[PDB]
Structures are given as C-alpha cells and as structure tokens.
Design an enzyme around this catalytic site. Structure first.
Site, PDB file in Angstrom:
ATOM      1  N   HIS A  26      49.076  38.961  62.307  1.00 55.52           N
ATOM      2  CA  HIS A  26      48.672  40.367  62.255  1.00 55.52           C
ATOM      3  C   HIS A  26      47.481  40.675  63.185  1.00 55.52           C
ATOM      4  O   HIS A  26      46.485  39.929  63.207  1.00 55.52           O
ATOM      5  CB  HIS A  26      48.354  40.726  60.797  1.00 55.52           C
ATOM      6  CG  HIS A  26      49.286  40.094  59.805  1.00 55.52           C
ATOM      7  ND1 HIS A  26      50.468  40.685  59.413  1.00 55.52           N
ATOM      8  CD2 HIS A  26      49.207  38.925  59.125  1.00 55.52           C
ATOM      9  CE1 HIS A  26      51.079  39.908  58.538  1.00 55.52           C
ATOM     10  NE2 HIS A  26      50.337  38.833  58.345  1.00 55.52           N
ATOM     11  N   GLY A 114      43.096  31.937  52.883  1.00 56.27           N
ATOM     12  CA  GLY A 114      44.473  32.371  52.704  1.00 56.27           C
ATOM     13  C   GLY A 114      44.470  33.093  51.381  1.00 56.27           C
ATOM     14  O   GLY A 114      44.625  34.298  51.329  1.00 56.27           O
ATOM     15  N   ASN A 185      37.865  49.810  55.970  1.00 50.41           N
ATOM     16  CA  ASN A 185      38.815  50.467  56.869  1.00 50.41           C
ATOM     17  C   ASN A 185      39.790  51.362  56.121  1.00 50.41           C
ATOM     18  O   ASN A 185      40.911  51.564  56.574  1.00 50.41           O
ATOM     19  CB  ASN A 185      39.611  49.433  57.707  1.00 50.41           C
ATOM     20  CG  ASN A 185      40.402  48.434  56.851  1.00 50.41           C
ATOM     21  OD1 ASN A 185      40.631  48.646  55.650  1.00 50.41           O
ATOM     22  ND2 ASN A 185      40.820  47.330  57.473  1.00 50.41           N
ATOM     23  N   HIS A 256      48.563  46.359  59.987  1.00 48.77           N
ATOM     24  CA  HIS A 256      48.110  45.293  59.094  1.00 48.77           C
ATOM     25  C   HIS A 256      49.281  44.363  58.784  1.00 48.77           C
ATOM     26  O   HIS A 256      49.115  43.328  58.137  1.00 48.77           O
ATOM     27  CB  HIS A 256      47.541  45.878  57.800  1.00 48.77           C
ATOM     28  CG  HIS A 256      46.693  44.916  57.022  1.00 48.77           C
ATOM     29  ND1 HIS A 256      46.890  44.665  55.680  1.00 48.77           N
ATOM     30  CD2 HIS A 256      45.645  44.143  57.399  1.00 48.77           C
ATOM     31  CE1 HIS A 256      46.000  43.783  55.263  1.00 48.77           C
ATOM     32  NE2 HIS A 256      45.232  43.450  56.287  1.00 48.77           N
ATOM     33  N   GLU A 403      34.765  30.338  35.451  1.00 43.23           N
ATOM     34  CA  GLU A 403      35.384  29.057  35.774  1.00 43.23           C
ATOM     35  C   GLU A 403      35.937  29.011  37.198  1.00 43.23           C
ATOM     36  O   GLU A 403      35.768  28.007  37.895  1.00 43.23           O
ATOM     37  CB  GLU A 403      36.514  28.728  34.790  1.00 43.23           C
ATOM     38  CG  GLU A 403      36.029  28.667  33.354  1.00 43.23           C
ATOM     39  CD  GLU A 403      36.021  30.009  32.584  1.00 43.23           C
ATOM     40  OE1 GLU A 403      36.315  31.082  33.113  1.00 43.23           O
ATOM     41  OE2 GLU A 403      35.737  30.008  31.355  1.00 43.23           O
ATOM     42  N   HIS A 465      43.288  27.494  22.724  1.00 35.60           N
ATOM     43  CA  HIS A 465      42.344  26.555  23.352  1.00 35.60           C
ATOM     44  C   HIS A 465      42.885  25.148  23.520  1.00 35.60           C
ATOM     45  O   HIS A 465      42.282  24.343  24.229  1.00 35.60           O
ATOM     46  CB  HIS A 465      41.045  26.496  22.540  1.00 35.60           C
ATOM     47  CG  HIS A 465      40.203  27.719  22.695  1.00 35.60           C
ATOM     48  ND1 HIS A 465      38.939  27.694  23.242  1.00 35.60           N
ATOM     49  CD2 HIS A 465      40.454  29.012  22.380  1.00 35.60           C
ATOM     50  CE1 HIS A 465      38.444  28.920  23.256  1.00 35.60           C
ATOM     51  NE2 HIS A 465      39.346  29.740  22.750  1.00 35.60           N
TER      52      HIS A 465
END
Lengths: 654, 648
Positions: A26, A114, A185, A256, A403, A465
């Site tokens: 792109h 990424g 943008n 884009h 986390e 949990h």
C-alpha cells in the site's frame, strides 16, 4: 537550511513504484507521512547506517500498518544495506523487503510489526529500556546511554486496546524521551470518534495538537517542543492527507488499499514535479539523504564516552549484559541451591518454588527485570525494588491489570538490550496476551512468561479462571518452550534453561497448590534439562505413567500402590515437551518404553499426547470440559485425578 | 428514607458467606453496598419471579472479587437463591459459584471472571436493546424499552478491552447504558484521569459522588436517566471494607473481625440472620409480578402488527420454516453449476441466502475496511439505524467478540463477526467465554493459512486452527468448497448451545463435493470424498488441502493404485459420530497420511491401526507469493505423492 519537497518526494515515488511492481502492498500512508519522516530522519534522528547495532542510537518504530515502504525508503535513502534491487523485490522470497517489516535481518528494522497496536507497546518497552540502562550505568560525570525513542502510529493502533494499556503505563512511568507521531488522516468517523488529544492528556502525556504534517517548519517546531519535555512522553498529532500528491487518489483510503495504476503514477509525478522514471533517484537527492558520513561521526563522538567508561566499576557488567552472557558464578550458585533442596526437601506450590529460584537468579543477574500484571504472584525476590515506587536500583515493575501490554512491552525490553525481562499473570490470562507471546517466539526473544494458577487445582475461583486448553494451546506455538515443573528442583532447572536460552522464549507454568518433592538424585538433574526423564526407573516395569507438573506426584503415589502388590511401574516426568521432542530417539524410548503400555496423565486437554503413545498402546487421561467452582479436593474427585481412579485405569493393563 | 440497616444486610451476608467458605472477598461488596441498595431498590425494573422477562433492565457485575454482592441482591429481592445457597458459596454444584455464571443461577446475566469483559458484555446488551427497539417499536407502541447498568472496578478500566468497548459505546450513543465505578481507596500503576478519558469517548461523566450517601447516589442516577444522547459513567468514592474497624480501607474476615464490624455498624444479628424489616424493604416480588403483567398487555397490543410473528419467532430462537428448502436449493444449484472460488467468497454467497431469510442475523467486522462478511442487503449501523443489520466495529477484535457475547445473551439477535484468523489471538478469551456460556456466536475467520501469501508470518496462522479446536464446546469448521461452506453455516446457525468458528481461505479452490450421498454426510464433520473398495491408503485433509488430496489421488489412479480421500470439515462434530463411522471414513486397516496447512500434532489421535504419518507446518510462515510458499513448505502434488509413495 529549508527542506525542498523534492527530497520527501523520493519516499513517495519509491513507495509508489515498489508497490506497483509487487502488485501488493500500500502506498497511501507512506505518501501521507513522507514529510514528517523526512524532518525526523534528516534533522533529528541520531543513527549510523554503517552500524545498525550502535547501542546509543535513537530507536525508531513504525507501528502502523501497511506503509512498510516508508521504512524501507528511509533505510535505503540514508545508506543502510538495503538496495534499490531489494526495493524492486518488495514482498518476494527471502528479501530484505517483506510486506511487513521483520526484525533480525533487514538492517535498521527494530521490531516486527503487522498486528496493530503492538508496535506502540514495543516502543514503550524500548523507551523503558533506555531509562533502565541509563540509570544502571550513567554517573554524574559520564553518560554512556542517552537517546530518544520515536514511534509512528495510526488510527487502527489507537483503536486497539493494547494501545490503552501501553500508553496509560508510559504516562505513569514518565517516559519523557518517548515521542509518538499520530498519522491523523481522517471514514473512521463511523467507528472512531475519540477526542484523541483529550485521551492522551488523561494518560499524562504532553500533547501537541494540530501540526500540519505537510509543513516542514511546523513539524520541526513540534519535535523541538517534544525534546524540551522533562517529565512526560509526547504525542504529536499530525494532520495529513493520505496519498498526498495524487490528484486522483489523495484522501480516499482506497489508496490505503491497492497500488496505483501506471497512469496514476504519471499523474502524481506531474502534480509533484517529479522528473524521474520508476526507481530512479537523482544523485542530488541521495546526496541530501545519505547519512553514512554523519553517522560515523556521531558514533565516533559517542565512542569517546565509551572510552571514558573503560575500567569503571560497572564496566565489566555492562559488557557482559550487552553480550547476553550469563555470569561465571551462576552455575555454582544453582548447584548449591539444588544440593540444598536434596538435603532438605519441602512440599510447596511451584509458584513458591519459582520465587525461591528467583532469589538465586536475581542475586546473580543484575540484568533480570521482573514484573507482574495485578492489583505479584511470587515474581518478586527479597531484593526487588519496584519502579512504581523508586527510580534508584529499580528491577521490578507492577504493570497493573494489563496482561497484553505487559507482554508487548517486555518484547521491547528484550529487543532493547542489556535486560532479561520476565512477567507474571494467571495462566488463563495468556488468552489476553497470546499474540505478544507469539511475537516473542517469532522475533526469537527469550522473554519468560510466568503463568500461575495452572489448572483446576486452583479450586474455588472456578471455570473462568481454570485453564483447560491453555497448556497444549501454548505448546502449539512455534519456537516457544512450555515448562511445567513438578517440584523445586524441576523449577530450578526449568528457569536455568529459560535464562540460558538465546533465541527461544519460555512459559513457566506454575501451581497454586502445594506438591510433594519428586526429584531424588543428582543423576536426574542433568536429565531434567532434556525435557523428559524417569522419576521411577524399574528394569521389570510393566507400564509407564507419563505425567507433567502437578500430576507427577499423583503418578508416584500410584506407582507406590502397585509396588505393594508386586507390580513395578515406570514414572516419566515431561517438564518440557518441546525440549523432550528434540532429544535422541534412543533417549526418548528409554523414558517412554515402546514395548510396555503408557498412561498419560495431565490436568489439561490431552489430545496432543497421542503423538507419544508407545507401540504397546495405552491411553490418555486429561480434562475435556470446563471446570467447576469448588475446593481443589472436590474437583480432583469430580474429574478423576485421584490415586484410586488412576490406579483403576492402570489396572486394565497390568 | 433508607436505614443503613437495609444496606448493611448486603455487607453481612457477604462477610458471613466468605468466612464460612474460607474463600472469596468481602471488601468490594462492603464498599459498594449502598450504591447497589439505591440502584436495586429505587430504580431497577425487574421481576424476581421471571428472570427472563423480555423487557427487564439488565444488570452486570463486571468487577472481580465481589460475587457475594450480586448473590445478596438476588437473595434479598426475592429470586430463587436461598440462605442455604449462600451457605454453599464456592462449593461444588452450588448456585453460588465464586464468580457469577450465566445459566443456572437465576438473575445472573453473564459470566464474569476475566476483567474488562463484563463492561463489553454490557455494551452488547445495551446495543441489543437499541436494535430490538428499532426493529419492533413504533411511535405509537413501545414493546422494548429498558436500561442497562454495569458495576466496574479499577482493574476493568486498566484492561484494553474496556477502551475498545467504551470507545465504541460512545460513538454509538448508547444513552440507556449507565456504569458505576468503584473508585475506592495505587497511583504507582494507575493514574489515569478517568473522567477526562470517558469524556473523550463521548460519555457523560458524574464526578465525586459520595458512595455511602444514599441521597447523593439517587441524585446521580436520576441525572444519568436524563441523558438523551450519551452513556453515563458515575464515579463513586468508596471505602473498601467499609464497616470494619480493622480492615476498612481479598481475605475473609475472622470471627473476631466479624463481631467487630457488627458492633461498629450496629448489626446485632448472627451469621446469616436477616430480620423481617429488611425483607420487607427489599422483597420485590409484588412490584415485579405487576410490572411484567402490565408489559404482557403491551405485548398483546403488538399482536396485530405486521412484525409480531417475527418478534415472537426470534425471541423463541426458532429458525424460519422456509430456510431448509432455501439451503437445499442452494446446494442442488451448486452441484449443477460448480465454480472455483475462495471459501471466503462461498461464505458471502451463503450469507446472501441466510441473511435474506433471517432478519435476526447481525453481522460485523473488525476493520478500517477481506473477510466478506457483508451481503447485498447489508445496512451498516455506522451509517443509519433504520433497518441496520451490520456493524463495523473498527480495529477492535476483542471488544467486538465480547460485545457479540452481550448481543447473543440479550436475545432476538444472532450475531456473527469477522477478523483474520491470526487475530483470534486478540479476542481469544471472548471466544472461550462464548463457549463457556453456551452462546452460539459465529466467529468468522478469514486468511486461514500460508496461502494468503505476501502479508507474511505475522498474519499467517500456523497454530490457530488446532489451538481453537482445543477449546471445550467450540465447533471449528474449515470447509473445502461451496457446498461444505453451506453445510457448515447451516450447522452453525442451527446450533443452540455451541459457538462456531468459520475458517475461510484467501485463495481460490476447486469443487470437491460431487454427490448427494456426500452432501448428506458433511454435517457429520468428516466424510469420504473418494471411497474405493480397493483403496491402499487414505489421504485425510481439511479445507484447502482436500483439493490437493484429490489431485494426488487422481495421479495414483492413473498408475492403477486407488486411494481414499477423507475430508474432515469439523473435527469436533466428527469425534461425536459412531465408532463404526469414524473407522470407515478413516479405514483402520490401511495407512493414512494427514495433510493440513497447520500445526499437525493433534492428528496422531486419528492415526489408523495400520499407521501412516502427518504432514503439517511446524515453523512460522514467510512473506512471498502463495505458489512459492507451497513449494518451500511441501504442499504440492509432487511432494504429497512422494510421501504417499512410501506406502503403496
């Protein structure tokens, strides 16, 4: 001293031309950010293209998606070893120019990006690294570490929750040398309407609003302002036009997506007065951009500081931690600890065993930097100094209930250098930080992910949990060692292997409940590092019970019962399947004998164990449902992890 | 008008239950008891005799270490949750587990444990109310009209998923959502200006409410109710452990500390003893039964409306009667007219049929903008509310998934939502929670393998398919072609209690299903694409690898060697089939080779007695065109044939 747009347009055309050739990638965002990048790289960035590993270089991270050609353009133009041919092979086999930038081969790429949001957290970790090393090694007379951290980020990054975690923490920690540039943008209105400046002031950042991202002088002033900050990290809000320079594509976000057509490229070249054909950069433009002479001078100047540091009290430690080598005395300290455990065995949870081990490692390793994500399950040692409270000698951080942010910040600390991060949460919460764990594996960073409360043995907190699928799900990730030690000596060996590892992260899987010791002999100690070994080795064994972690003691108790009835069993402990899998064939078949059956016992989803079934057969005993809220004892009965039930299973074979 | 005695009831049930359990935390219930008392007794519209009343307000306890607060509220207002149940807090099989669980305990709206997600579930429930009210109300008759309340804590606010859900709630203008923050006595790790952050999301914020002042609390809630456009956050200053001389400001109190709190708060009742006047204040059965009866009359006025039958059908969770024929027609059409498409495209084609037939379907995707989750009839809530049946969630995978759990719980809505399969790592725990809560959400996951090509290892799944197969109660479908994709979607929408993952390709695939006999077995999760009496070996494959298996089998056919080919589009469903069927599809007395572009260690479970081997992927992916990657990783007709040739 003024910058002509010609010089920034080199970025725009390399990016357009490369993406057109690849028919992939792109050009919009690189076209939008080229002027900002030009000011930052050519007027401020402290770097040496001849040595991308220079320890006092500024760090730059491109967090935002697409637009990889922005970074490859910058590296090429400034004189890194990234060629025009490499640019012509953007997104093809083995190149220095993959579709998303990858750390480890391409010179000057600081992290692998990424997945959105994580680049910002990695940059936070890098800025924390600089803070930590400068504290450790600078003196009033001599700074050997002193540089900035810069990150480019976009709207998608800001929407991601990991950006909330990392930037909230950056603000609390006062990382004043961290400077972020937001590519503002913007169709985002339909799903993204945050007041971003207000949000970042809420985090305690300094915010520079309304910077014209196509005005070189405005960009330079904003960076000057950011540099003057003594207390807060800075966000520079850069108003840009995506696809700037394209009369047809500017501001569409379709830019884009796809590359430009041949006709649009020629039209962009007309609009921008760019006289050059595909991939052609005139020598005048290379002359402005090339940073080889200046970079050599910058490093030479810094080398003066390093020379002043020679022979100082902490000089040998500095060299050692940067080299990533362990201290010479560590091995003796570890053996002494193991000898103490053989002499005076204790029944403790492996979370406590891990804390006991960290007392030994952290005493000996000034590079260790621990932490936890809560409102600290045994991740602290007696000498822990929390950065939350104290700058002086800090070696631990409470990350709060963050986390994923903690994991992605630790990736940045690991990449930074001189620091061995580890960090704790409950094992179920590995689901929150999962992709950052994967990224430590992909980037070959030996982060240690400490995961407590590993099973239904945690008891009353219940099924939300209690891990079931977690241990095997982590075993599936490439280049990740999952250690699930049974007792204090297995826990020590697991941590030793984890800190020795140069290229592979580890998960340390720890119990809530107390476990009886199982290691008895020095001979077993070296075999524990092989990932699997015999706890009970009988020449006339009729069956092997194969177990890990908390199930090894259960296996021993069953073997005891059968011993009374005159029947010998083997008991194998597999504290790390990944390591065991790499052992010699003959060794693996001594631990799990092929000609007698095996019963595999683990309080996790057990489908992966069929890989290890001996020729003689057997079966697996795991958990396939979610758990229940009850005391641990009632859960073991409910799910069949009892001496009686496992005995009844074994009885089928012997 | 409210004696402290009436809120102290929550305090002592919570203290006494946690002491007896020797587990759990009374601090947060002690801090928030007065806020809860005002909310529940002066505002909440509910019927303890019918916790499923369609027009009830929804309450969510998002925060941890506070289960007894909810159990106390349910008990005191008259729900079927007894003192005996409370005496069995945290004990096996009880109605009072350590974290609240949807499904058995009456009045519990969601399952909460992992922090931040409760808030996202509440955003989903408020979105649900807005969707159904838009679908079924008219200017003259409101069938759906109620609030959504959520209690939350510091840890919830630190979690990223709170940022995702609360940012989106502001954009969507969910004005009937009201949140209460337990701002209790940690600046070292949590120093946000929380009010400024929430104003930045477009929320209305009420600051500095004294959480122990009944009058101030009621004033704040009335203020929240006057909001026409924004959700509201009410910032409540509390004293954790409030009432305890020794502990005020997560361990059960001792016998001695319990006696002390009682003296301090003037509570003169024994463990679990609650006096008449407290039940008289709290019990809500009379007012609740009337609330519902009244509404069932509004419901009956709706009986003549054109949308009434649909309203009743979707609330009932019934499928439309014409759906079965529509699907069969689609499948027959595909057998008559085969096309080579990506399963991502097959999925969009299937949704055309499903969405035309099922107005309750509510789609969405997480992006700036190749999932193919929209259909020609899509109307995006981001653009218009009238007829909205789709939402762009932005780059918010975890928040989308957790919001979908809230939509599914809410009722009358069948959510599905798309991201790239790798990003299931971001939303992983919300997917697990769909499974734990038995909500049949469809998680649509594109870009399933190294076959996506140039985007490279950060985007290419390796461990993802098998990692999701490990989650209990989650069906993972990986269809090979248009007909498998239709059957997979059919089974996913029919499922009452099990979520699904739909795993789809970027790259194009040739049709493998040939006959109606095969079609009839696809819903068994595994079936034979090629079944030869003289078969020498079976190639077992899923998704994009089935066409590779077929190509290899056709090459062997030319040399006079017959192979079986088994396609296993859903291992979880295949595993439930009869023993005889499973050992027929994977014939036990001939070797098998398993082929799948994923980490293959789980396939050893299915190895036949006769042996064989697995061919999967154990490394990370790489940035290159797909064709080049298949050569490097060995997914070619040549390499798979070479593996097969070792056996035949």
């Amino acid at each position: 001293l003024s910058i002509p747009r010609e010089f920034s347009n080199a970025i725009r055309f390399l990016s357009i031309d490369a993406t057109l050739k690849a028919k992939s990638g792109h050009p919009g965002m690189p076209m939008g950010m080229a002027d900002i990048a030009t000011v930052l790289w050519t007027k401020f960035l402290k770097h040496n293209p001849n040595n991308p590993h220079w320890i006092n270089r500024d760090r730059f991270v491109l967090s935002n998606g697409h637009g990889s050609m922005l970074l490859y353009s910058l590296l090429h133009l400034t004189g890194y070893d990234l060629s025009i041919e490499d640019i012509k092979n953007f997104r093809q086999l083995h190149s220095k120019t993959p579709g998303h930038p990858e750390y480890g081969y391409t010179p000057g790429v600081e992290t692998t990006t990424g997945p959105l949001g994580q680049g910002v957290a990695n940059a936070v970790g890098m800025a924390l690294g600089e803070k930590l090393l400068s504290d450790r090694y600078n003196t009033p007379d001599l700074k050997v570490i002193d540089h900035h951290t810069y990150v480019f980020l976009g709207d998608g990054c800001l929407m991601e929750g990991v950006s909330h975690e990392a930037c909230s923490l950056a603000g609390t920690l006062g990382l004043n040398k961290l400077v972020a540039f937001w590519d503002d943008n913007n169709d985002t209105k339909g799903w993204f309407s945050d007041n971003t400046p207000e949000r970042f002031r809420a985090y305690g950042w300094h915010v520079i609003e309304n910077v014209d991202g196509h005005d070189f002088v405005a960009i330079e002033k904003a960076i000057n302002e950011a540099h003057s900050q003594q207390q807060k990290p800075t966000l520079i809000c850069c108003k840009t036009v995506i696809g700037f320079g394209s009369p047809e594509k500017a501001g569409t976000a379709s830019v884009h997506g796809s590359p430009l057509s041949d006709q649009e490229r020629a039209s962009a070249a007309k609009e921008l007065n760019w006289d050059y054909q595909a991939f052609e950069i005139p020598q005048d433009v290379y002359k402005y951009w090339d940073a080889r002479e200046k970079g050599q001078a910058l490093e030479a100047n810094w080398q003066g500081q390093r020379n002043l540091f020679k022979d100082s009290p902490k000089f040998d430690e500095f060299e050692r931690v940067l080299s990533k080598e362990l201290p010479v005395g560590l091995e003796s300290a570890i053996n002494d600890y193991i000898a103490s455990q053989l002499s005076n065995p204790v029944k403790v949870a492996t979370r406590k065993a891990s804390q006991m081990v960290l007392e030994v490692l952290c005493k000996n390793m000034p590079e260790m930097f621990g932490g936890s994500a809560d409102l600290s399950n045994n991740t602290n040692w007696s000498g822990s100094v929390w950065l939350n409270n104290t700058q002086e000698g800090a070696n631990y951080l409470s990350y709060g209930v963050r986390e994923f942010g903690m994991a992605a910040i630790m990736n940045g600390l690991s990449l930074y250098g001189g620091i061995k991060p580890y960090g704790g949460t409950f094992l179920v919460f590995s689901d929150y930080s999962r992709n950052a764990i994967r990224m430590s594996a992909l980037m070959k960073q030996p982060v240690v992910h400490v995961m407590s409360h590993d099973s239904i043995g945690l008891g009353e907190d219940g099924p939300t949990h209690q891990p079931i699928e977690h241990v095997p799900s982590l075993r599936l990730i490439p280049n990740l060692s999952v250690w699930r030690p049974a007792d204090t000596i297995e826990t020590m060996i697991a941590w030793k292997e984890a800190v020795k590892s140069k290229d592979t992260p580890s998960v340390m899987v720890l119990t809530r409940q107390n476990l009886m010791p199982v290691v008895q002999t020095q001979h077993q100690v070296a075999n524990i590092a092989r990932g699997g070994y015999l706890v009970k080795d009988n020449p006339d064994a009729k069956l092997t019970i194969v177990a890990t972690g908390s199930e090894v003691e259960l296996a021993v108790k069953v073997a005891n019962e059968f011993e009374k009835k005159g029947i010998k069993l083997n008991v194998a402990s597999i504290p790390c399947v990944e390591v065991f899998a790499t052992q010699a064939h003959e060794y693996k078949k001594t631990v799990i004998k092929d000609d007698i059956p095996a019963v595999f016992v683990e309080m996790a989803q057990p489908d992966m164990w069929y890989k290890y079934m001996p020729k003689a057969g057997g079966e697996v005993k795991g958990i396939y449902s979610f758990g229940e809220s009850a005391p641990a004892e009632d859960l073991f009965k409910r799910f069949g992890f009892t001496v009686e039930n496992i005995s009844n299973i074994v009885a089928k074979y012997v």
